[PDB]
């Protein structure tokens, strides 16, 4: 998701008092409303309760290094919460998919949708689940009767972009005092002019 030409208030996003976890690096959480950037990227995905610790800059595992890499210069903001009452149902239903097998590492902020069967040995299988040829897509373990470590958590990543553009998405003051008949400086979305 891309946020553009919209004013955003992050105070309502914090006063919900329902999120289980909140990790927000790069910028201090109390002073990100006044500071503004150009574009805000929202990446939403589901994950298990034991893999929420893997989502951090400088971690190694089986999900972060194969699905969504976190670089060292990660100024994103991670929000997740417990949604077991809606994302899971009885009957052993999961309705979500992950990737476990890959040939090598991938670049950060890259989406991998390849369904090719990962070959382990030197013998090709011609696209079947033969020996040394395992499908890289596996089933979840979501269940409403589990505990707290395997629950469905909806992780959203709110990253920021550093590039030359006027701040379309920002949290500034809505209206300062209005002064007339004196030589003042104003910024009315198109100029930096000093005059009466």
């Amino acid at each position, epitope marked *: 998701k891309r946020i553009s030409n919209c004013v955003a208030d992050y105070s309502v996003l914090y*006063n919900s*008092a*329902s999120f289980s*976890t909140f*990790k927000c690096y790069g910028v201090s*959480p*109390t002073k990100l409303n006044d500071l503004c950037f150009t574009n805000v990227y929202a990446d939403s995905f589901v994950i298990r309760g034991d893999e*929420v*610790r893997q989502i*951090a800059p400088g971690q190694t595992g089986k999900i972060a290094d194969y699905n969504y890499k976190l670089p060292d210069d990660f100024t994103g903001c991670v929000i997740a919460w417990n949604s077991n009452n809606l994302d899971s149902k009885v009957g052993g239903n999961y309705n979500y998919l992950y990737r476990l097998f890959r040939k090598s590492n991938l670049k950060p902020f890259e989406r991998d949708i390849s369904t090719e069967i990962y070959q382990a040995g030197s013998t090709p299988c011609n696209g079947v689940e033969g020996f040394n040829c395992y499908f890289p897509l596996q089933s979840y373990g979501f269940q409403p009767t589990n505990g707290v470590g395997y629950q469905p958590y909806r992780v959203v990543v709110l990253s920021f972009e550093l590039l030359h553009a006027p701040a379309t998405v920002c949290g500034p003051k809505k209206s300062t005092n209005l002064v007339k008949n004196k030589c003042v400086n104003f910024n009315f979305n198109g100029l930096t002019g000093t005059g009466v």
Partner: antibody
Amino acid sequence: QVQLQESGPGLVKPSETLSLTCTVSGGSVSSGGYFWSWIRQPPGKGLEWIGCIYYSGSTNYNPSLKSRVTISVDTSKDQFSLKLSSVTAADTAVYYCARQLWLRGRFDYWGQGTLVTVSS
Amino acid sequence: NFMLTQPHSVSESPGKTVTISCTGSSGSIASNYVQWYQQRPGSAPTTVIYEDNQRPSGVPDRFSGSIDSSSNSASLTISGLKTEDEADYYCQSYDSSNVVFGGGTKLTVL
């Protein structure tokens, strides 16, 4: 800047209704979208979280202290007060009214600690 | 049922480096922010570090915190011990709408 001052009777009677009020001078309770909380600390023991409040009716309490903490905020006098029920001899602790902005963060400003102990 | 396990007594000579741990039982340390507090005996507590990697304006650069989510123990590395550093140290968490503090590490004299 801003400072926090506590008031109310320091000594506490057994099995009664505690009344401690924390006042704020140099700022406004309602402005800034600011939270308020109370923290007690027994002598020789660690800090214990009692509860936190907003300038609206939103509040949360420790499950160990649940259904015993009653905290209210009045904007006209610019202060917030806490009421404790069924106080015992194990509740003798140094009470701090806590100034904090981030609910998951830190208590940047701390008021002076009032000594609360069973009366003789 | 989430608590922060903290050592009771930590004692070292001045001028060296120390490590103070803060272990979470159920919830992971990387789930929520951890705040450390330094309090003189008989006074109000003061925040010595917060956000797990950055120092507030006023404290020296010797107060450093590190997080290793594999062992679920919040670490606070303090180097160059002085006279004024003798205090109790408490780590803070949030869990889920319920602020949980640490056991307390009374940093001894010298």
